[PDB]
């Protein structure tokens, strides 16, 4: 949905596998690679793709990445509040942090959060250690994240009476 090449971008690869398809006779393989894409100013998205070679596969993953996009509700260089991500036993848990701390997380989720423009944030992976599921859970957590203005409009009252 609505891929844009107009903003600045930073490609970032998480993992590459050598993945095989067995047939009679030989043994056919096709490389795979997942990528995350964001402009590190409040917008992010992941990506997947497969091909018989590295550069073509990662290009496919990136061109499919911009098509799925994330608004990344951010505040003060940190997430507005603390949450728990869950997707297919790939659980994950994030929590805001005082400035100067920095993103601490696993490699893939560090890349996800560093590339979404968050500076200081606390988190720890849980459950499964495979990059794909925990990355998708991280993005799912960012999808159901809200900020003060995103809620104050909904409830009849306003900000400055309910605030972080």
């Amino acid at each position: 949905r609505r891929e844009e090449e107009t903003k600045e971008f930073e490609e970032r690869v998480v993992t590459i596998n050598r993945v095989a398809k067995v047939v009679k006779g030989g043994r056919r393989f096709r490389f795979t690679a997942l990528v995350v894409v964001g402009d590190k100013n409040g917008r992010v998205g992941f990506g997947t793709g497969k091909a018989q070679e590295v550069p073509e596969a990662i290009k496919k993953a990136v061109e499919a990445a911009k098509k799925d996009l994330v608004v990344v509700p951010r505040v003060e260089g940190t997430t507005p509040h603390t949450i728990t991500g869950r997707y297919g036993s790939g659980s994950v848990f994030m929590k805001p942090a005082a400035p100067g701390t920095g993103v601490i997380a696993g490699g893939p989720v560090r890349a996800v959060l560093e590339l979404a423009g968050i500076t200081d944030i606390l988190s720890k992976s849980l459950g499964s250690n495979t990059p794909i599921n925990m990355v998708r859970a991280t993005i799912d957590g960012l999808q159901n994240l809200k900020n003060a203005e995103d809620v104050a409009k909904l409830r009849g009252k306003t900000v400055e009476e309910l605030y972080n």
């Binding site: 909904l154 409830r155 605030y163």
Partner: protein
């Protein structure tokens, strides 16, 4: 035999969120009316309307939904449940979601939101978070 009415009301509320229906029906109680009033005062409840028939209740509430039909909260649950009752001091009282959410808590002077309970420096037994 029903072990807990608060569990019933919160399950009814969440199960109303999952299908989105403005009206719901549930046997009322004094604590139930008070917490419904505070729910309306936060802004999550469009309207409140108690009714009377033999004998209790039955409390009818009107839900709230965004213009794009978006559920206001992202989760709702209790803390004080039977067997393991819980309590909370005035300073130790937790800030769930900070301003974002609130923390219903029952006190020696009555049930109020999390804020006023920390302002007055009087704690009590928490009941349910909401956010």
């Amino acid at each position: 035999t029903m072990t807990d009415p608060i569990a019933d009301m919160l399950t009814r509320v969440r199960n109303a969120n999952m299908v989105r229906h403005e009206k719901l029906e549930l046997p009322a109680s004094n604590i139930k009316k008070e917490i419904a009033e505070i729910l309306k005062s936060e802004g999550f409840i469009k309207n409140v309307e108690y009714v009377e028939d033999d004998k209790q209740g039955v409390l009818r509430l009107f839900l709230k939904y965004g213009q794009n039909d978006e559920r206001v909260i992202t989760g709702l649950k209790r803390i004080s449940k039977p067997g393991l009752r819980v309590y909370a001091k005035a300073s130790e009282m937790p800030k769930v979601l900070n301003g974002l959410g609130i923390a219903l808590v029952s006190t020696s002077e009555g049930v109020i939101t999390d804020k006023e309970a920390r302002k007055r420096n009087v704690g009590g037994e928490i009941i349910a978070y909401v956010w």
